[PDB]
Curated annotation (Swiss-Prot), chain A:
Signal peptide: none annotated. [4Fe-4S] cluster binds at residues 32-33, 97, 127. It comes from Mus musculus. Hydroxylated ar Arg-44 by NDUFAF5 early in the pathway of assembly of complex I, before the formation of the juncture between peripheral and membrane arms. This is NADH dehydrogenase [ubiquinone] iron-sulfur protein 7, mitochondrial. It catalyses: a ubiquinone + NADH + 5 H(+)(in) = a ubiquinol + NAD(+) + 4 H(+)(out). It is a peripheral membrane protein. It is an enzyme of class 7 (translocase). The keyword Flavoprotein does not apply.
Swiss-Prot record, chain D:
It holds the Pfam family Oxidored_q2. The chain crosses the membrane at residues 2-22, 26-46, 58-79. Its EC number is 7.1.1.2. One of its GO terms (cellular component) is respiratory chain complex I. It is a multi-pass membrane protein. Its main location: mitochondrion. One of its GO terms (molecular function) is NADH dehydrogenase (ubiquinone) activity. GO terms for biological process: aerobic respiration; ATP synthesis coupled electron transport; proton motive force-driven mitochondrial ATP synthesis. Core subunit of the mitochondrial membrane respiratory chain NADH dehydrogenase (Complex I) which catalyzes electron transfer from NADH through the respiratory chain, using ubiquinone as an electron acceptor. Part of the enzyme membrane arm which is embedded in the lipid bilayer and involved in proton translocation. It is found in: Mitochondrion inner membrane. It comes from Mus musculus (Mouse). This is NADH-ubiquinone oxidoreductase chain 4L.
Curated annotation (Swiss-Prot), chain F:
The chain crosses the membrane at residues 1-21. The lineage of its organism: Eukaryota, Metazoa, Chordata, Craniata, Vertebrata. Pfam families: MWFE. The gene is Ndufa1. Complex I is composed of 45 different subunits. Accessory subunit of the mitochondrial membrane respiratory chain NADH dehydrogenase (Complex I), that is believed not to be involved in catalysis. Complex I functions in the transfer of electrons from NADH to the respiratory chain. The immediate electron acceptor for the enzyme is believed to be ubiquinone. InterPro entries: NADH_Ub_cplx-1_asu_su-1. This is NADH dehydrogenase [ubiquinone] 1 alpha subcomplex subunit 1. Belongs to the complex I NDUFA1 subunit family. It is found in: Mitochondrion inner membrane. It comes from the Eukaryota.
UniProtKB/Swiss-Prot annotation, chain H:
One of its GO terms (molecular function) is NADH dehydrogenase (ubiquinone) activity. The gene is mt-Nd3. This is NADH-ubiquinone oxidoreductase chain 3. The chain crosses the membrane at residues 3-23, 33-53, 64-84. It catalyses: a ubiquinone + NADH + 5 H(+)(in) = a ubiquinol + NAD(+) + 4 H(+)(out).
Amino acid sequence: RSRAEYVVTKLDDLINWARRSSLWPMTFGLACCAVEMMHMAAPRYDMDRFGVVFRASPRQADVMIVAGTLTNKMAPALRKVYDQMPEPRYVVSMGSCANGGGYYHYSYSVVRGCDRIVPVDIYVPGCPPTAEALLYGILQLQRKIKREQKLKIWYRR
Amino acid sequence: YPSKETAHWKPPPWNDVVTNMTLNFGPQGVLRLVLELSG
Amino acid sequence: PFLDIQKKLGISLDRHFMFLSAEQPYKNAARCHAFEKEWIECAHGIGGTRAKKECKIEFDDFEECLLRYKTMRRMHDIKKQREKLMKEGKYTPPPHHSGREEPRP
Amino acid sequence: MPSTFFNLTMAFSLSLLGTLMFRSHLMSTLLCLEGMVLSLFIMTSVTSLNSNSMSSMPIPITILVFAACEAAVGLALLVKVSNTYGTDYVQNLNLLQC
Amino acid sequence: MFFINILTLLVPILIAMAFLTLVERKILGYMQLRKGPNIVGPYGILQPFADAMKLFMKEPMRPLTTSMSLFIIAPTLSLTLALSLWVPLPMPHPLINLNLGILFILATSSLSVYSILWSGWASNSKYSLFGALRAVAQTISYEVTMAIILLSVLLMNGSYSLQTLITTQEHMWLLLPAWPMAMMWFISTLAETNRAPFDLTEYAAGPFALFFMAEYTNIILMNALTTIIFLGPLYYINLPELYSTNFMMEALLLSSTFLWIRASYPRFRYDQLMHLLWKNFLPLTLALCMWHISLPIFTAGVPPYM
Amino acid sequence: MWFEILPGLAIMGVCLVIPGVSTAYIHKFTNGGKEKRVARVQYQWYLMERDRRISGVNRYYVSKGLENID
Amino acid sequence: GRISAFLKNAWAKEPVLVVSFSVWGLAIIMPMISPYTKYASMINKATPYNYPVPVRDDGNMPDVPSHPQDPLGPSLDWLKNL
Amino acid sequence: MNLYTVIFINILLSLTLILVAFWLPQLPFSMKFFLVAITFLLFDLEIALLLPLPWAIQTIKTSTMMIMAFILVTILSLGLAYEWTQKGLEWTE
Amino acid sequence: MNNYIFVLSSLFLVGCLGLALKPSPIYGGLGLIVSGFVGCLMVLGFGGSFLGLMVFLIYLGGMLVVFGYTTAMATESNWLILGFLVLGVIMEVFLICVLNYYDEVGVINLDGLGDWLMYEVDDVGVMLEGGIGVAAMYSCATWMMVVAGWSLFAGIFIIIEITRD
Ligand SMILES: CCCCCCCCCCCCCCCCCC(=O)OC[C@H](COP(=O)([O-])OCC[N+](C)(C)C)OC(=O)CCCCCCCCCCCCCCCCC
Ligand SMILES: CCCCCCCCCCCCCCCCCC(=O)OC[C@H](COP(=O)(O)OCCN)OC(=O)CCCCCCCCCCCCCCCCC
Ligand code: SF4
């Protein structure tokens, strides 16, 4: 192909590498799944070693880890915090509650999945899914945002 | 001397004579705190 | 001053740094120390009116030292005349005023 | 030095005229007061350094300290005004006319 | 040649700042029985570069209600004050030899607390403004205790120069004559840098990266200043590389001491921090200030002007 | 293990060796194999200006000894 | 007795104020005790920041020396032996 | 000239950093804070008085300088003691 | 490099003009900080670094910190102040020009710019820097020393008494 598209592809590689190497989350943590989140933060799995910084503010956050049961009383707060997060933002839903309501699916005060409120990038299944599996979801997110070609789309505009 | 430009004045008194923080503690996150502070 | 407690008790709370020719740290003379000393030596003991009338020569010398108004007038006149002779071109600067001279310590 | 001293005196004059022409902000009035204070400090310091008056270089230090305590007093007064009226607007300060 | 010296001073300082972020991550991980970043790069050496590139690549969420003037001014001011703080430092020879370099340092810290105050007022939130006022009060109180401590130790030294400090330190460390002062100075530098246990903690992407850069640069500088003042490196007129290496080693130990303290201790309360300073340091600071006034008088050890 | 942090220690140690050593070397190179003469007082500045005037090349660091005296 | 107990339990509960006050008192009293206090003033007087202007002698004063390398004058052997 | 060059380079570097940072993505008053602010003003001006001591240590009249410095640091201590006794140092209703 | 001090004085005049023009008090304090830095630069250019670092360390260092702090506990646009500021700076340029041409060498001289900054300096000599006399306030002017100390002590008493409420 053209020489300019090669440079554009390499620039996409650099930008995607930066975004997946420096992935700062805030965990909108509610429950059991947030406990298992901090077990992934724990020294065995070491997302800080992976480049993923524990306890970041929503202003400095890249991905929101929806960890727990999203209730009707909490969904406006979830949407507000998601709106306060800057534009390059991803969503990792974790657990059956945040995925599709889970064990409280037929409840009067439980939102059937956080995808009804925020656009979810990756769903992590389990109740709770292990910290091993959540770290799998994070690495899958890094691969997914490695697959992005934003300057390639812009050049092909 | 009450004139039109000074008749609205009143004599001085003989003796010459709570706004608080309504903070919302929260996403440090499933806890809401309406917290009433004096400084 | 209005009250003379300092003169009555003989102390000098603030009288020893009144002017430039007063006491200085490590004997560092201020500018126009000699001129101000001459003015004070003239003006002492005769009062303000006779100091203004009679010590006008000393006061004018001290004021000229302190403000350099006539010095600025003279140097500006010299520079303006030199610039005019630059413009009409009948004069050239010497090597020592053009930055090319043999230095001396 | 005479041009810069003239500029400093015009700066003091502008700050004084700003002090004399009030706006809604007593904070702005105090800031103009310290514009005058700062201009006074520069004129005193340049005069002392030009005259080599080592005996009188403490005078800028004294004007700085004294004017700073005076402005601390004024800031305390502005705090009292802001507490009693919500704001520091000088038109709220007018019930001593009668 | 002077511009080359400027470049070879400032660029390695920024490299030291980025790798200070990396070594803080690694030391905190290894003190928490885990590892630092090592996947990003060979042994994590590309992790600060990835962090900086992501921070400059992410769009800054700029609220329109925030004043663009102050939003611009605060981080650029903080970074330029960190670098201006770095310039007048002799290692054992400075880029710029100032007559009153320590006064320059302290007043540059005053302009830094302007920077944090302006950022807090620009951040249009009442909680942000409250935390800003708390942080300015913290920085201000530890600045006044730094100024008095530093005044007394230079009363022992002789002048506000730093080569005079090197000549003072060429026989022994100032830590032995002024070690309680050294402890209070260390705590004061900690609370200036807002490190744990004095952190007591708004901006996204670009400004956040700039503030992070300036804060870590100030951390390295407080370590370097503590080294140069209190713990004199070995100085010889025929070789300055020994002084540079020894100052390097002591600065690395002091930076590791800040990371050590952050790992070890829980943070203070705001009332406890003000109580600690205004009721334990400043009485001791004033008493030791008058003691160090008295010391050369009754020992006849008045230092020279040069 | 704990020695894995020593890469970062080595990078920081190196990049604090460059500034001071480079500053001293640039001072020696710009002043002719000698330290940069400091003028903390007007006496030292006057000495620098005197050396600059004696040296005859408008650089103060060209010191002249007894070869200038018969 | 009671005063000694007051300083003792003050030192027990909080030594910061005790150390600061003792350092205050020591800073007051030690210039009045040490024999080196006058030597600081002597050294500051002996330090020659200014040129010593020579005096035109009429021969009526013999205390001033004609030469710097003379036994006459304020030598600093006390400073060398300090 | 050197310090002017370094400060200009510093400001230019910080300005270009904020410029590439932008171009690359394409009330209830509390009295006690004012109290510690003015206490800092007073103590900072007392520092401004205390600062010339590295040159005041070289004076001939060391006794008078020592007495003035002792009196000044004593009134620092007395003012701080006043504020401590009248509760200007605590954060309590 | 001879117009450096005049450029600094003009910048100080511009900052004082804006401060008199009275923007929102945060921006007024910013202009006062700029004017303080400029005054520091003028003092450093004219003489010893000590008085400049008093401006830069006590005036800038503490005093406008407390001004900014007290403004921060206060509260407040209309963008007119910039319009009168640019009008004031072009009027200032015109005024200094007409004063320069009209008074020949009086208060302002174009040819005399930079010629009369340092009048007379002791080229050979130690004990000339600006901190020496201010240190002699400890010895020569003990009355200065004690009135400044009593001013600060009384100011403490005054401030807690006023804010006692
Ligand atoms: C410069 C090189 C490096 C030095 C430091 C090395 C690293 C050390 C790191 C340690 C951990 C620090 C983490 C933060 C801790 C914060 C808490 C803290 O420190 O609080 C301070 C604590 C506070 O104590 P506190 O919290 O118990 O409060 C005291 C008040 N009461 C008890 C009423 C509640 O201590 C101090 O403030 C004391 C400071 C040191 C004073 C030392 C005085 C020694 C003697 C003086 C001289 C006497 C003789 C004079 C000459 C006589 C000659 C004859
Ligand atoms: C984003 C907006 C930010 C606004 C604030 C900017 C802050 C920048 C960082 C802090 C700079 C602090 C400078 C403080 C003044 C210098 C202090 C000092 O000690 O100066 C004296 C020194 C020489 O004195 P001495 O040591 O006695 O030497 C003689 C013996 N050989 O040296 C001198 O005499 C040199 C005199 C000049 C020194 C200062 C240079 C300032 C340069 C201009 C800055 C602004 C530029 C314009 C705006 C740009 C865009 C924002
Ligand atoms: S999915 Fe299961 S483990 Fe997770 S929050 Fe819901 S009930 Fe708890």
